Amino acid sequence: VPQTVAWSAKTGAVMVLSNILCIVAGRYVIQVKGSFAGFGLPELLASTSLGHIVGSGAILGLSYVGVL
Amino acid sequence: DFSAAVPFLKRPTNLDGQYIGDVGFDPLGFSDVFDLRVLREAELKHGRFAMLATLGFIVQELYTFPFFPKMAPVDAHDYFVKQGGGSQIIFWISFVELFGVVALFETLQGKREPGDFAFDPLGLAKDEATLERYRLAEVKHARLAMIAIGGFIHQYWVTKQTVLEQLGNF
């Protein structure tokens, strides 16, 4: 079984970083919606949902490879 | 506008008060899809069965015919399944229910009220106002006995005691 870790501040840091990266990426690449003008609740929900998806994948992968 | 019984619900459009006992109570909207004549015939039939059932639980446990063994009414269903009286009662109810089918077809043609079987041999309703008053009384007793018969049967299933002994202790 691949090693997963208990919740810590590192897990929170990775999740927060992935969420913020996905929020900025969603600001830049979403075609149909000063830089945060037009920023609405569905776009925030989509970006934070991708942020949990990317953060979960990154946390599981870094726990797999030993970076924790 | 709104229902007379439930003040925060709108009045169902097909509940205009033509049927005695109407307080505009239909939150699931059964009258919006189904024929109200059929629903009222079903309500009165279910209720009259339940009224006779509750009176039967009271009398049939107070008194029992000498030509029958003594047992509880719920066990009496299972006994008369095998003895053959229950088949006789089911047969005669079915026989009357064939003319009930004919009466329901007459109701759907608009030639008969949804509860009118023209059965008043003792002449108890003389004039109109008495008939509306007894209609409201019958509808209320029908609904009340429909709740009460389920109460009787389920409480016997849990306590294994009849109504009148359950009244004496707890």
């Binding site: 691949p2 997963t4 149909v32 776009e43 949902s49 | -």
Partner: protein, 742 residues
Amino acid sequence: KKVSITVDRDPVATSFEKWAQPGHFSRTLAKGPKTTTWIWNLHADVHDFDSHTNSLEDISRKIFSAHFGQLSIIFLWLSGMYFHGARFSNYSAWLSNPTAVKPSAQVVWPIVGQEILNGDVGGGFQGVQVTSGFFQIWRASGITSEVELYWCALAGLLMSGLMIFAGWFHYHKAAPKLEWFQNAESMLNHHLSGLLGLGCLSWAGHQIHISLPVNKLLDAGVAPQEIPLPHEFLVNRDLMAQLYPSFSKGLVPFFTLNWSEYSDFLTFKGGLNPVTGGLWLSDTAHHHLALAVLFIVAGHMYRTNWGIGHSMKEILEAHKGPFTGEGHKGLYEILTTSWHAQLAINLAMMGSVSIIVAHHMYAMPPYPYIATDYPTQLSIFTHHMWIGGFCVVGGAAHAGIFMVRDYNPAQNYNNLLDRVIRHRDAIISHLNWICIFLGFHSFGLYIHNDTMRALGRTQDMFSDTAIQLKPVFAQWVQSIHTLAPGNTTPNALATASYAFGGDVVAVGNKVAMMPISLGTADFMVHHIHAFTIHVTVLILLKGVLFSRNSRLIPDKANLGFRFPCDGPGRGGTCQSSAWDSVFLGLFWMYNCISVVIFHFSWKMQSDVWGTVQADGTVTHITGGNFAQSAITINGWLRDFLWAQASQVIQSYGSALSAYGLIFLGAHFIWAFSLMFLFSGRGYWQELIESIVWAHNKLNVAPAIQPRALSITQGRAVGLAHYLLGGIGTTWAFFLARIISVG
């Protein structure tokens, strides 16, 4: 918003008037019969909604409500199976002794001696043995009593009533508008995330919370009556944690991404459960949970009222290259306007999925005690193979219907459809050549082997003891999949299936699964399969691509999808429609699926299924005769057809005698079909003229003038009785053989 709910209220009055007017839906048919042909026409075009009206909205409403009606029928059927399992089955005795009680959920009444069909099925029970696999499904679901089966039957009946009410409501009371139906993105989002995703998630919930503890107690040897009820597994976390200790940790490991804590009930074991011979239920629970996550993620792809999401029209129009002109442009309009194109795609996909189900369900048995239930395995493989073949040919048929009816060349200029039509001759010619090549170099190997074995030259045959045709690629793939645990799937304990290689998983002295080796005979029969599939594709694709016109008939689209001919001219134009191509492709599908199921039956009986005895040797049902006999047609005739039909022809006077009767009756219906297939309409019309004279002589000629069946109806009736006869013959033969010997 753009995606919204638009509904018309009370569009069609609920009335019995049109029930008394047969043919009301068609202006041609509403005039009433004058000939008997009308009657056939009344049953032939009735659910062909687009030919009754041109309004897409009314067609869509009819389709939605008919789908509700089909769902009601399916729910009634399921409720029937649950009820007949509850009341007329030996399911409790089977739960106590799965390896020795034959499943049976049908009991016949004694009338004319048919009570002999109530065979001694074990468990103190007499009935007809059933092979649908419902007992194994209910054991996998954790159903331990017949009371639960009664409640399941009630749930099925209630859902059937709900579906039929929904059909009446959504046609006759509140019919959605055309704009509601034309939301492909919203429908895909809801059906991917809500239907498949939440369905997988809730079934994973049932598997984790109900199926795993009950089946763990069953495999440990606990009697079904002493197993706790499922709600006790729900509320007593200590009882759950006795079997899986990670349940003591609750839902904290899920939300904190400490998922490995759940490794005791979410596993990646692979292989099979040694006690039951089925897949590990923990593996299935992780599987359905992972599928739920993937499906819910996939259900957020497509654009809806809010700005996020993909637009499928943009995706299609962006994918275009130098070989393909305008590319995938115009396909979104086709697939949002033509119901027949969607039916073509979905029927093709559902058929391919059913075929995949048959392969993957024999090879990795998913239910407890289903692997050693050989009649169930053979029945479900054959059944889902047949359903798959029928649905694939139906996808081709409704593709041809789209091409004749709904195709518009103005909206299809230089896109992929237009370019496919414009090089149809190259496509069909290359497919024709590859079909002839496959036929020669696959079937002529069998003919060559027949001749060599008949001429006494065994060293000149294609066999493993002779000139060899080794299936090296499939053997290499088998070696890879055997070497995969620990190397390319390092966290899997065992192989995905033991059919690729490994140990002999045996349950109750019967082989659940063992390696399925591939030799010269397997090479020849897989290339026979490739030949038959390519020829079926040739027939169906030639019919679809030449449905509108050809060099023979330049105005074929004006004649329609379904016409008998364009007359004896041009040399003869018989069977020129796309419908007739579907008619021939159904025969070739029958041939293909028949060879596939024969290969399956012989290979499993010869090399996989059997009894395990002392020193670990496996005695197979036919003793390994496939390697030397399946290389000739004589070997298929003698060692498979002649040898294994002994059980169905000696079934008279036993419980399996119904299979012998159905065997004879299916041979009869198949032969009866050849009267319709080989003959023509004019003979029967003149014979009917003479019979009409006979009835006219006695003044008993009918007012509805009797006519011979139409040419298309002659073909359709011959094909229907042919398929029924052949499939019924294989049905009776398979079932009698595998019930007797397995």
